[PDB]
Amino acid sequence: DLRLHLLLNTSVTCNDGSPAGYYLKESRGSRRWLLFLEGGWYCFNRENCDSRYDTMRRLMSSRDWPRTRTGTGILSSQPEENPYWWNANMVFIPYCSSDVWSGASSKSEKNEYAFMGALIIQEVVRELLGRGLSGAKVLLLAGSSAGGTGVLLNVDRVAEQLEKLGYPAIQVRGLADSGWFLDNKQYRHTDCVDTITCAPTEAIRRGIRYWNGVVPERCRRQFQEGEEWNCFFGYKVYPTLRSPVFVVQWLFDEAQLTVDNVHLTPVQEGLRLYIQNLGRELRHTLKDVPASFAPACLSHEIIIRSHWTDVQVKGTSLPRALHCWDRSLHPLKGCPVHLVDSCPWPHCNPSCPT
Template sequence: MALHLQSMLSSYRRVWWRKFNWVIVAAAVSAILLLGFSLFFTTPNKTTHFTLVSDMVPLTLIANAQKTGAFCLDGSLPGYHFQKGFGSSSRNWLLHIEGGGWCNTIASCSYRTTTALGSSKYMDHEVKFSGILSSDRYENPDFFSWNKVKIRYCDGASFAGSPETEINNGTKLFFRGQLIWEAVKDELLSLGLSNARQALLSGCSAGGLATLIHCDDFRDVLPKNAKVKCLSDAGFFLNEKDVAGNHTIQSYYHEVVQLQGVSKSLNKDCVAKNDPSKCLFPQEFTSSIKTPIFLVNPSYDFWQIQNILVPVSSDFQGDWFKCRRNIHNCSPSQIAILQGFRNSLLKALNDFLQINGGVFINSCFIHCQTWMAETWHGPASPKINNKTIAESVGEWYFNDKTVQQIDCPYPCNPTCYNMEFP
């Protein structure tokens, strides 16, 4: 069951191979995500179930953000999509933070201001809610009737930037990620989040990292008797050397932290002991988060393989050209390196697993999985021990069980959706 990207990826393919241009890659991938990954999945014998609630949800800009200076990179107002809950779930809330990479230079952040990842001017006025945000009880059995919010991502630093560094950049860029998070949170609290009985903060990719950064803060503003947990999807980025022995991702994160003044938003204990850029890596701080956490991560996360393990700048001879686009094209020696990357993930998770953190680590070549119907929950969805991601998350959230689903190594799982780039 492979994901075939055709004409929509042609322009993306042309920019992908420019020498390590991270922001173009992030924008291209995010544009694909925003246009609807699910359009490219083939799910045999899938039955469509209709609900009375529309899955197309309008964009709301945060008017009060003007007062606090909570702006997107270009100075426009941040936004979110809100679908009101119903029935017995009217006081239950699910928040999902959009992903889309980061920007580490003036040029890359400036580029983002011409996209929805840096300006609300380019955001869709309506988006489809699917997967964990769906209102279809068959697609999303546990959360379909909750209040659901998709938080749009337009700051380029996982909602952790600070305006203190703006004076040095000589441009009109706004580094207000932390202020955006505060503005979104305050508006949702006024809409009923302050009376929540159950709440789940979730996010994908850079949004998954933002979820981990802000998880305890989210818990602290809600009623003490509320059940509050956090779910990070494809947000556990590894601090690994690339295949050429370079610290590519660590250097990149260092530039993001320095440019956007991220240090103040990071785990204080971690920052006190390390270079702040290291504290963007979840392995450095996840075990100290007090709020219960569930991690959904593929062992062969294509984004991490293509940008952390084998960035274009380190594939000198082009030996990884086919492998990094399609795991089925990898040679035995390349598979061995990917297995080593999987081992690094499991090692980095060790402390988290010891404190009974919840995980769903499948052996798929994919990135985010919770917000797509095909991978979240359905007859053909990826499974571990015959359970979908949604079933595993539901068991962890509602039954307070230790759920640690860890897949066998590739290619053992026939239920995987594996990404294929042309």
Template sequence: MFSANSRAWIHPLLCLIFSLVSLDVDGGPVPMTILQSAVAKGAVCLDGSPPAYHFSPGFGSGVNNWLVHMEGGGWCRNVEECVERKGNFRGSSKYMKPLSFSGILGDNQKANPDFYNWNRIKIRYCDGSSFTGDVEAVNPATNLHYRGGRVWRAIIDDLLAKGMNRAQNALLSGCSAGGLASILHCDNFRNLLPASAKVKCFSDAGYFIDAKDISGADSIKSFFTNVVNLHGSAKNLPSSCTSRLPQSMCFFPQHVVPTMRTPLFILNAAYDAWQIRNILAPSSADSGKAWTECKLDIKRCSSSQLQTLQGYRSQFLQALPASSSTGMFILSCHAHCQSGDQTTWQAADSPVIDKTRIAQAVGDWYYGRSAVRKIDCPYPCNSSCRNIDNE
């Protein structure tokens, strides 16, 4: 299932769409900062190259507000997979290209009314551990550096020095593996900012659940255990979780969120396309390839497969935090990552729950205009999913 050549764990098409060719109603490419000073701290990408981020300065009323968004892109759980990433932009800043900001990062007031004039940062993802790794030793045979936790801290320190230490409002966000990172680093982020600042966290498609696959195996649990062990992630996982549970269990949001102190908003599809393909029905559990078409297009699922998907939705909903203080927008779309592109964040035909678009829900929650805890009806009830299903 999880071979070194498998792209399922990296979902490159989605990441390229959101990272390189996002619908740009806001402007041209955003400059990339290569953080050379991080190298001396050992805060480097898998190949030893310096980490990078894109920074669009805030203006007007948003000059002291900071939105830090972490890029997604799967994980590598063994040497072979990490070596493969080392040869592309998922493991080296040498291969990173310019990108434009859109969606939650866009600077168009109509398209992104609550965050358009904030300081907006996108941290590039080049470590394969959701920014948690920290292994000192480097094998010269592979030259792999497992330093994601150091990368995150080096970039945050650089942003603090550039004015984030005076933040009045701040939001730590991310998509997919970056959405998981926004949960794992949330309380730490809060601790690094002024006590007077309003600090919250936002996870888009990062709520990966601890569930068995269709064969009854714990595929995702095994995978995450290998990631944590390889990257030495334990020291950067929330101690509020690792003090209670085995370390690798604390890579699952459902075991971390209940003890978080910082407000969190969860944006996720109940039929998350990546989770269906890789947690529920990975190739190792589907040797007969009966799920191949269903995984690619939910409309091609058989009645029994749809019943299984409804069961997965139930497991997903049960894994969500019960606290009413956690914001939620749980769509019934077959999609993955929805905040980084204008078409899903806020557009005329963006997906809605109760006539509310994602951008409005997140803004209402962040500013406390209303409590937001929206959970969609089961598939296929939401016709507004039509433009994003199966992406």
């Protein structure tokens, strides 16, 4: 049950200029630290950010944040719920920048909102070092959905940040949940004229300009000016990262089907082959990712659900795979790290959530 701390450096703000922050449950008998990045879409122009402020203000402001918040799934401190890291120091960073954790722009004359996702992370790490992070041995940067993509964009900074601050011995790692998207062909098409018709490739390219967005340097050097949107897609940015990153991704992610303009509520040849192709292509992008967990389910997010221990791939649950990943960073008999389903339809894995 984690306690809120608003950032001491008041220049690092949410969208509306209110200070950003983090929730902390500290565990003095542990040198392990878990920093979780919240998700929740994004906004890429004035009009859609304005609408988001009326109906999703908690994702744009700290004004109405509660003082405590309860830890779930991987953020739980009970072994029964969290077999993986129940005794670790727990940190939940709320997503109030609407920029996929990439922005570095302040509010001012010329900017109605601030987009400081990359700087919010950066400062949480700084202030945590004065609360015990200085004695850590592993820092696991995790996140779900837009926070999952934020892990891929930010994990190597946090590594580079801690070396420049004199902490080269802390091992920085990443855990990206449901943030591994494909810029594939859509099932039905629309031109980018408003929020709901703009495909993520077009929406992200406009967002980076609007946010002053920042991407990892090696990926930036590959795709070069004005093609930085490529680095928000996992299979393109992952090969540029030096930190160890574990990738969790449903094969038939609900958010991926949404941006592909697919709805499930009588499926035919047209759509059957489309859905089957989607599972095939994302399985392909994971073939050479040594640490991964990809079940054949229709869902979205998992690592902070309380029942995250129920899903299995080839008999191995997600908390076990993460524990096997820790062992491999010291192949392991009966303790695998690469777990990708091979059956081709949603919920062909019986452990899929209902």
